Design a protein around this ligand. Structure first.
Ligand SMILES: [Mg+2]
Ligand SMILES: [Zn+2]
Ligand SMILES: [Zn+2]
Lengths: 1226, 99, 471
DNA sequence: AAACCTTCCCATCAGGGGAAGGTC
DNA sequence: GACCTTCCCCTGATGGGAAGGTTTATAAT
């Protein structure tokens, strides 16, 4: 019924259009009848009837005579709901400016006349006159004057000279103004006069003029001649309990405006002086502005209450209220919540739902299904049947639940997995059963956490909860290909317990037929579980054309691993169950299962693993006691030794052999190096603790200490908590960071004393508060990310660019951090990649680089792959499937319609809640320098002269597995292209973050200590002496040489004077500015920079996210640009890129561009859709600006649609929008 | 607590989040994002169209659910019409265009 | 500063105060202006003809004696009978003696007895407006006769004023300019109908106002000057004593009304107290102005305080009840009994509870609810208007059940039922209404209805409908 | 806040009339 | 059978009352 939302200026007549009356008396419901008063703020005649299909007078009650205005009251008997649609207006006496068009930072009325704000504000307050349309006099057309200035001024020129004061003056000035002639004049002032000052406001004033004309709305409308009123149903006066009436602040403000306007008119007809009427006009302006926006003039308070009343604009913006708490997030029917618990017996696809909850939820289904089966006469009877809890209705509920998926949500929703669809399982009680394997994805515990349930209604929402949201369809996370479904504490512990072996278990070394007999041995109680028994096992392995071949044979194993083999699926070999089977092992086993047998097998495998784990981990005893913690009997000594090692340092400082900050480190180093002693005392005594006789020979093996198995399995206990458990727990520091020279010396088992607990208390408080107060930080980051992302969806099949970013492994310092295979897997090639020999084809132009091509390229020495990215893709208002990649809950190419923007924003936002000498080559190969200038000296060896110098290692393969940087003037012992031995020191010299970090990385903020860059090659040169800062000239080689710059002398340099330095060189040290990285390098360099830096902060701690996601943010950051020339053309990159290129296809000349770099919060500012901007950004501003321009929103995007309540143009909504938009506009 | 069809706020026709258990659950922005991540479109719509707003949507959906017909008839979220009022009651004129 | 209260608080520091000199000095100026405008009416025969009609109707029960006169400058009811025939001593000496030579120096003594009767401002303003309407009527004709010759016939303005100044009565000037043979002369015969007949509404005024067209202009010419004097004086008066209004208004802080609202509603009463003040009585102006200022503040409060406006009387009564409850806190020890103020007040007993029951104030829906959270009162407000869907379904089911059942009866009974009740039809019909177009009337239908309601009262055809009743 | 006064809207009372009832 | 007294419904009166309006004189900044 609509496909376009427009916003324009409200004209004083277009207002009288909507209004169904003129509120005159500042009244309400009467006082004694509670009935609306004539021409009041609730007048039934003006707005609408009180009752439904009934008049106020009470003469017309029947629904028959609907359209009629009873001459008694003038109230047309109709639906009382119309009192919500009924507008109104007020005939303001003196003109009044709209505050929004005067107070917003780009003051609309202000730069509409090029008149400074401090002047118009003086005119409004009636503290100065102003000339208007002088024509030919001693005064201009816009000029200010005071009392004595206006005194002897009308005598000079009575006619042709007009000068008003206040709102009348501003308005009439806007009326006689020519938004056409003035525009033609401002064109040349930008054309000839140089000096940006002449172009600062002009370049933005010409735009306001031309847009003010193109829209159509006139400038006189900047002054509200008629004030529209709000329907009484949007500001109800409704009564309440006890008789007290509850009203809105909008009323108080409206009543005020009406009172003061009435008073002004009464004065104007009562023949009052000017000192009174000019005060009334200002009071009126005050009331009106406080009604539209309260908090910009003086914050008019409310009545009996001291709190300031809420105005109109305040009912729109802010996280609270409309647009944020109403249109994007609302409460919903058919839902609930409860405390969640365990539920192992449940399958990975089902969840236990409390019975009574299901009854109340599916009430509407139950009623109908009952009245259908001949069990309830009518709907009302079915209600009583379920209200009585008759036996039949339970079976009816079981019939309606049957395959009807439901949705479960965990309170903080970081990623998409926060909402997952399960299959209802009716259960007794009131607790919600949840599947343990999903607790990881949900990131929930069973310590009292609550979850919410949602029941779909449409057959669609029931299918999407089965083929999109169902649990068993979401196994591997989209952020990283690693599965989000991995065994937790008890499961991994049971498995690790089974897959163990000591040496002398009851009956070890024998042989059995297979798993059946091994279990017959365990359960009977004849054999142990950890015996080293070797048996036969048939390991299926489909080979040679895809035909399953079962090769049976014997292997070395344990009685336990062979039993666990009964759960293992077919295709997987036995090598997966030959180890200690820790958490980090079970997970990779399941992963290989997934990408060997498929989804369907992996699901049942996971469920079986969970059941078996829990059972075995239970029956293994697997407890903890006071004796388990093994306090090293060496502790006492190890303590007192290092306790006396400071007694010499104390005298060293008492005499003067070491200063304070010198013996401080003398204590700190001996204490840190002594803590390893106490920590390793229990460690090497706990990793080999248990000692038993193998067949009769004493020997030590992997210990069986209850606390330790929980560590080697990764179940719960990490390593540090062990050093704290049995030994003393470290040294704490005050908030200063002053680590105290008084370490803890007692452990947790012995018990801490009063003194020692204080420093622990500070450490605890810092951790507690730093994690608690960080919630809003990560939330804010991901929120701005989703606001920069949403509109970005996968639409186009193939863009058609060979561009591709250049993917190379991270290899840095010592060893690789992430191989090339990962940052290339599942992506797409840009250009044909060949073998180390030229003119070959390892892979064609562009093809999905799935596991196969990964292995194939891994065989060759090709460590450099050209992969297409989202940062470079020929696509308008979207992306092409190839450039993105494949990553999803499946290894297939990204589908046409999934909104990659939102999923990427979540993929970055969820991991956010976790953050806060010489060189020695290792591997053997050949020294391969890179970008270094050298010179021979006395020693005959080589020395570096260029600050930047890379140290690669060309091995016998031809790849690079080493990369070290060496500063200026280094000691070299091989040279470039020289052979090296097993770790030869070829380098020597004299050496003389978190979430707030990634926030800056995305915001493109300018660094504190920037580093200048070069704009062209050629010898650099100095210039004029130290005046204020310093100078620096650029000397190009062949082309023009007009480039230069001023670099302060207080900032040291690094570049060489008489040396060629290409563009984008290190002209100084310090951090780097991304804006300067886009200009002198290009669009791929900057994205390659932001990704490499943002990946480091996440790489520090255990976080992994495919570069693809971050690439999408980078691409959204450069969607704007600046034009260099004009060309044949008459900002947004895509729009100009198509609009000028269509005429560039024509012989007409094109116009060049320059990518601009806008932060995630500065790019989310400018957007085609104004509604989506005013949704999260500064609504009050956005709307004012997009209103003077007459901007027109066609919504084309996600948030706008969810606002107007429409199928989002993505996914299931993208298919509907496909079929609609096809015939739409065509 | 749980709710299927309860009361509604007067100002904005949304399920009353009070009455301490008889009120409907809150479906904030992050939940909408999680829905946007999947292809689920009718789920999100029926969330913020039938189950909250749309004075006709609730009634039509309820009268359909009992007829064995699971089909929503999405309308216009009442909160958005109220937003149109609050914007148009100002010196701003907001409107809608073709079918 | 910014706030517009500062613009005003320092807008009065300009005009210096006025005490003991200012008051009595400029009040004389006020009266000296109204004296100029008063004698302007002294020569206006329409005022005499209008005074007779409103005078004799006083003795015929329409207009009160003290409602048309504030007194005579010459509360005594006996001073009337002695000035209703002694003033006519010049009535008939100048009117019927035009048969107008000695009728030029005998008009002042006839108008002298007209300035000893102070009329109430109510009729005085009607007299001023009468002279204004007469000026506008006379002038309409000039702005007609002028643009009919200048803007149409293209004649110089000076040749118009020269031939018009002095006559303004007859057509001796128009038809005399025809012999000038000027370029505009040959264009004066066409407009000889819009200027000749134009004097029918202009010259006739002379026989109504008994004065030449030009004298009617002289009177208003000086009257405007007088009224301007009065205005220019009163504005300065209120500017001087402005500070007094603020002094009084600062006694109402939390009166449900902003400060400037109060000071303005008080300035209105200041103006009113000025216009009705006589410097003759001697009593200073500060005593008199305070009454109107303070009352125009108090009653204004009573009218703009409550969002639900209440008649003034009730405000007074409620405040009195509050006062009595206040002055008795120290007597009873804590607070008076409910039925105690019934006697202390003049009003009866049972009206106390209602007067206090309606005295509630509306609470802002934005008042934050408990827990101090952003949750406000406007969030817990329900909606008891929309019927729940569980009943809408019952309605849509009963519709069909009744339809099928009624379609089970006869055709006659079917239409009769769908007629007597508003079933699938606009507005049900009464007895003879149905009989009007069913060919048998007044008891036929009364039998058909009972027969059908009985054929449905029987079971096996009502089970479906009967289930819809549950009590 | 009190004091005297006009307009309007109330929900009710003498008065008229159209017949109505009952008898010297 | 009339004549007198009686029994109920419209006109319009007109008592009652809530709701408004105008003044109030020591001076009062
Ligand atoms: Mg928890
Ligand atoms: Zn009516
Ligand atoms: Zn592409």
């Amino acid at each position: 019924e609509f496909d376009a939302i427009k916003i324009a200026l409200a004209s004083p007549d277009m207002i009288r259009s909507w209004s169904f009356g003129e509120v005159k008396k500042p009244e309400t419901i009467n006082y004694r009848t509670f009935k609306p008063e004539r021409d009041g703020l609730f007048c039934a005649r003006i707005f609408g009837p009180v009752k439904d299909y009934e008049c106020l007078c009470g003469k017309y009650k029947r629904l028959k005579h609907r359209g009629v205005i009873c001459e008694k009251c003038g109230v047309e008997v109709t639906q009382t709901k119309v009192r919500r649609e009924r507008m109104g207006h007020i005939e303001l006496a003196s003109p009044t400016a709209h505050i929004w068009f005067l107070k917003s930072l780009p003051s609309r009325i202000g730069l509409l006349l090029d008149m400074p704000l401090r002047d118009i504000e003086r005119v409004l307050y009636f503290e100065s006159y102003v000339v208007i349309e002088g024509g030919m006099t001693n005064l201009e057309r816009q000029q200010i004057l005071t009392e004595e200035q206006y005194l002897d001024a009308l005598e000079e020129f009575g006619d042709e000279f007009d000068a008003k004061m206040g709102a009348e003056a501003i308005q009439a000035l806007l009326k006689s103004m020519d938004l056409e002639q003035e525009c033609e004049q401002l064109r040349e002032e930008l054309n000839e006069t140089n000096s940006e000052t002449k172009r600062k406001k002009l370049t933005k004033r010409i735009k306001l003029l031309e847009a003010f004309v193109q829209s159509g709305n006139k400038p006189e409308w900047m002054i509200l001649t008629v004030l529209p009123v709000l329907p009484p149903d949007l500001r109800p006066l409704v009564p309440l309990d006890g008789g007290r009436f509850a009203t809105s602040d909008l009323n108080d403000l409206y009543r005020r405006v009406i009172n003061r306007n009435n008073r002004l008119k009464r004065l104007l007809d009562l023949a009052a002086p000017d000192i009174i009427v000019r005060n009334e006009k200002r009071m009126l302006q005050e009331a009106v502005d406080a009604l539209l926006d309260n908090g910009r003039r003086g914050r008019a308070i409310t009545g009996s209450n001291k709190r300031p009343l809420k105005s109109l604009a305040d009912m729109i913006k802010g996280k609270q209220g409309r647009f944020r708490q109403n249109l994007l997030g609302k409460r919903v029917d058919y839902s609930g919540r409860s405390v969640i618990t365990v539920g192992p017996y449940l399958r990975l696809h089902q969840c236990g739902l409390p019975k009574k909850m299901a009854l109340e939820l599916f009430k509407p289904f139950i009623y109908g299904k009952l009245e259908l089966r001949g069990l309830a006469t009518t709907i009302k009877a079915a209600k009583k049947m379920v209200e009585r809890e008759e036996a039949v209705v339970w079976d009816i509920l079981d019939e309606v639940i049957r395959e009807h998926p439901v949705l479960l949500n965990r309170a903080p929703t970081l990623h998409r997995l926060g909402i997952q669809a399960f299959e209802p399982v009716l259960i007794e009680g009131k607790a919600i059963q949840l599947h343990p394997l999903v607790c990881a994805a949900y990131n929930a515990d069973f310590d009292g956490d609550q979850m919410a349930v949602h029941v779909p209604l449409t057959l669609e929402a029931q299918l999407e909860a089965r083929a999109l949201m169902m649990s068993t369809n979401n196994i591997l996370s989209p952020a990283n290909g690693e599965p989000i479904i991995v065994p937790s504490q008890d499961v991994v512990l049971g498995l690790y317990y089974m897959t163990r072996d000591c040496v002398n278990a009851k009956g070890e070394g024998m042989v059995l037929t297979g798993p059946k007999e091994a279990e017959r041995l365990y359960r009977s109680g004849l054999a142990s579980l950890h015996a080293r028994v070797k048996v036969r096992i048939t390991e299926y392995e489909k080979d040679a054309n895809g035909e399953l071949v079962a090769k049976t044979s014997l292997k070395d194993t344990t009685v336990g691993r062979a039993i666990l083999w009964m759960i293992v699926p077919k295709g997987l070999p036995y090598s997966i169950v030959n180890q200690a089977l820790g958490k980090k092992a079970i997970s990779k086993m399941l992963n290989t299962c997934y990408r060997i047998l498929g989804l369907k097998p992996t699901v049942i495998f996971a469920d079986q693993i969970m059941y078996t784990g829990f059972a075995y981990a239970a029956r293994s005893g697997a407890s903890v006691g006071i004796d388990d913690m093994v306090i090293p009997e060496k502790k006492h000594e190890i303590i007192s030794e290092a306790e006396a090692e400071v007694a010499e340092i104390q005298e060293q400082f008492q005499s003067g052999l070491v200063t304070a900050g010198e013996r401080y480190n003398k204590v700190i180093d001996i204490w840190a190096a002594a803590n390893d002693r106490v920590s390793k005392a229990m460690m090497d005594n706990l990793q080999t603790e248990t000692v038993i006789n193998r067949d009769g020979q004493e020997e030590k093996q992997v210990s069986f200490n209850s606390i330790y198995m929980m560590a080697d399995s990764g179940a719960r206990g990490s390593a540090a908590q062990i050093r704290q458990l049995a030994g003393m727990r470290g040294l704490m520091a005050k908030p200063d960071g002053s680590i105290i020279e008084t370490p803890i010396t007692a452990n947790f088992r012995e018990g801490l004393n009063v003194l020692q607990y204080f420093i622990s208390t500070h450490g605890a408080r810092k951790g507690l508060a730093d994690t608690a107060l960080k919630t809003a930080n990560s939330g804010y980051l991901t929120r701005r990310l989703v606001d920069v992302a949403q509109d970005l969806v996968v639409t186009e099949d193939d863009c058609g660019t060979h561009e591709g970013i250049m993917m190379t492994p991270v290899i840095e310092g010592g060893d690789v951090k992430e191989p090339l295979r990962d940052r290339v897997l599942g992506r797409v090639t840009a250009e044909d990649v060949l073998k180390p020999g030229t003119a070959d084809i390892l892979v064609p132009r562009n093809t999905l680089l799935h596991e196969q091509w990964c292995d194939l390229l891994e065989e060759n020495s090709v460590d450099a792959v050209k992969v297409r990215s989202v940062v470079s893709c020929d696509t308008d208002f979207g992306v092409c499937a190839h450039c993105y990649g494949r990553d999803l809950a499946r290894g297939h190419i990204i589908n046409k319609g999934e909104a990659i923007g939102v999923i990427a924003a979540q993929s970055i936002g969820e991991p956010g809640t976790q953050l806060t000498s010489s060189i020695q080559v290792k591997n053997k190969g050949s020294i391969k320098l890179s970008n270094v200038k050298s010179v021979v000296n006395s020693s005959g060896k080589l020395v570096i002269t260029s600050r930047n110098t890379e140290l690669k290692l060309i091995d016998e393969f031809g790849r690079t597995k080493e990369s070290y940087k060496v500063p200026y003037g280094a000691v070299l012992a091989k040279g470039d292209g020289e052979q090296v031995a097993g770790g030869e020191t070829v380098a020597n010299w004299d050496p003389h973050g978190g979430l707030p970090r990634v926030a800056d990385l995305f915001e493109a903020r300018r660094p504190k200590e920037p580093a200048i860059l070069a704009e062209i090659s050629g010898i650099v040169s100095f210039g004029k002496e130290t005046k204020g800062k310093r100078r620096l000239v650029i000397t190009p080689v062949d082309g023009s040489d007009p480039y230069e710059e001023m670099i302060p002398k207080w900032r040291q340099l690094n570049v060489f004077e008489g040396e060629r330095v290409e563009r984008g060189d290190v002209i100084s040290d310090g951090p780097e500015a991304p804006h300067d990285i886009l200009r002198l390098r290009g669009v791929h360099a900057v994205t390659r920079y932001i990704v490499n830096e943002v990946q480091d902060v996440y790489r520090l701690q255990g976080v992994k996210i495919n570069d693809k996601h971050i690439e999408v943010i980078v691409r959204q950051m450069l969607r704007k640009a600046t034009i260099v020339n004009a060309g044949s053309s008459d900002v947004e990159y895509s729009r100009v890129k198509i609009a000028n290129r269509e005429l560039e296809a024509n012989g007409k000349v094109g116009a060049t561009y320059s990518r601009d770099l806008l932060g995630i919060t500065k790019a989310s500012l400018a957007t085609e859709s104004f509604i989506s901007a005013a949704s999260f950004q500064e609504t009050t501003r956005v709307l004012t600006e997009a209103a003077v321009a007459g901007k027109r929103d066609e919504l084309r995007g996600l948030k706008e649609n969810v606002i107007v309540g429409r199928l989002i143009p993505a996914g299931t909504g993208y298919a509907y929008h496909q079929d609609r938009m096809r015939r739409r506009a065509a | 607590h749980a709710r299927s069809t309860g009361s509604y706020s007067l100002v904005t026709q949304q399920p009353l989040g009070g009455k301490a258990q008889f009120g409907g659950q809150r479906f904030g922005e992050m939940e909408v994002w999680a829905l946007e991540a999947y292809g689920a479109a009718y789920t999100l719509q029926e969330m913020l169209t039938v189950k909250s707003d749309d004075v006709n949507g609730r009634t039509k959906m309820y009268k359909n659910i009992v007829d064995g017909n699971h089909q929503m008839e999405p309308g216009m979220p009442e909160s958005f019409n109220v937003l149109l009022k609050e914007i148009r009651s100002l010196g701003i004129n907001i409107e809608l265009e073709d079918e | 500063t910014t706030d517009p209260v500062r613009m005003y608080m320092r807008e009065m520091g300009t005009v210096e105060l006025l005490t003991r000199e200012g008051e009595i000095d400029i009040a004389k100026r006020i009266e000296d202006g109204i004296n100029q405008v008063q004698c302007s009416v002294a020569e206006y025969p329409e005022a005499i003809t209008y005074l007779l009609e409103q005078y004799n109707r006083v003795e015929a029960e329409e207009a009160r004696l003290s409602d048309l006169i504030t007194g005579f400058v010459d509360i005594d009811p006996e001073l009337a009978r002695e000035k209703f025939a002694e003033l006519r001593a010049q009535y008939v000496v100048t009117r019927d003696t035009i048969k107008h030579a000695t009728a030029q120096e005998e008009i002042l003594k006839l108008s002298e007895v007209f300035k000893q009767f102070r009329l109430v401002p109510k009729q005085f303003d009607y007299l001023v407006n009468s002279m204004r309407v007469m000026m506008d009527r006379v002038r309409t004709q000039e702005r007609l006769i002028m643009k009919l010759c200048v803007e149409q016939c293209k004649m110089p303005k000076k040749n118009f004023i020269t031939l018009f100044t002095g006559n303004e009565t007859s057509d001796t000037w128009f038809n005399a300019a025809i012999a000038m043979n000027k370029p505009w002369s040959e264009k004066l015969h066409d407009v000889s109908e819009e200027v000749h007949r134009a004097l029918q509404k202009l010259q006739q005024i002379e026989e109504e106002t008994g004065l030449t067209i030009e004298q009617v202009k002289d009177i208003n010419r000086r009257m405007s000057i007088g009224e301007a004097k009065a205005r220019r004086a009163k504005k300065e008066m209120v500017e001087a004593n402005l500070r007094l209004v603020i002094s009084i208004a600062k006694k109402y802080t939390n009166r449900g009304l902003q400060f400037l609202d109060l000071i303005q509603e008080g300035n209105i009463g200041l103006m009113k107290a000025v216009d009705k003040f006589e410097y003759r009585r001697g009593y200073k102006f500060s005593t008199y102005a305070t009454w109107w200022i303070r009352q125009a503040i108090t009653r204004s409060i009573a009218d703009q305080a409550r969002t639900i406006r209440i008649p003034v009387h009730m405000i007074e009564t409620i405040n009195k009840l509050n006062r009595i409850s206040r002055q008795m806190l120290q007597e009873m020890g804590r607070e008076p009994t409910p039925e105690e103020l019934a006697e202390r007040m003049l009003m009866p007993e049972d009206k106390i509870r209602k007067v206090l029951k309606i005295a509630k104030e509306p609470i802002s829906m934005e008042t934050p609810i408990g827990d101090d959270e952003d949750s406000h009162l406007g969030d817990f407000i329900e909606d008891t208007t929309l019927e729940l869907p569980l009943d809408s379904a019952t309605t849509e089911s009963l519709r069909a059940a009744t339809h099928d059942v009624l379609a089970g009866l006869t055709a006659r009974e079917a239409k009769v039922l769908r007629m007597r009740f508003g079933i699938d039809m606009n507005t049900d019909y009464t007895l003879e209404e149905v009989g009007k177009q069913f060919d048998v009337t007044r008891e036929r239908i009364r039998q058909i209805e009972a027969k059908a309601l009985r054929k449905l009262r029987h079971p096996s055809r009502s089970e479906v409908l009967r289930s819809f009743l549950d009590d």
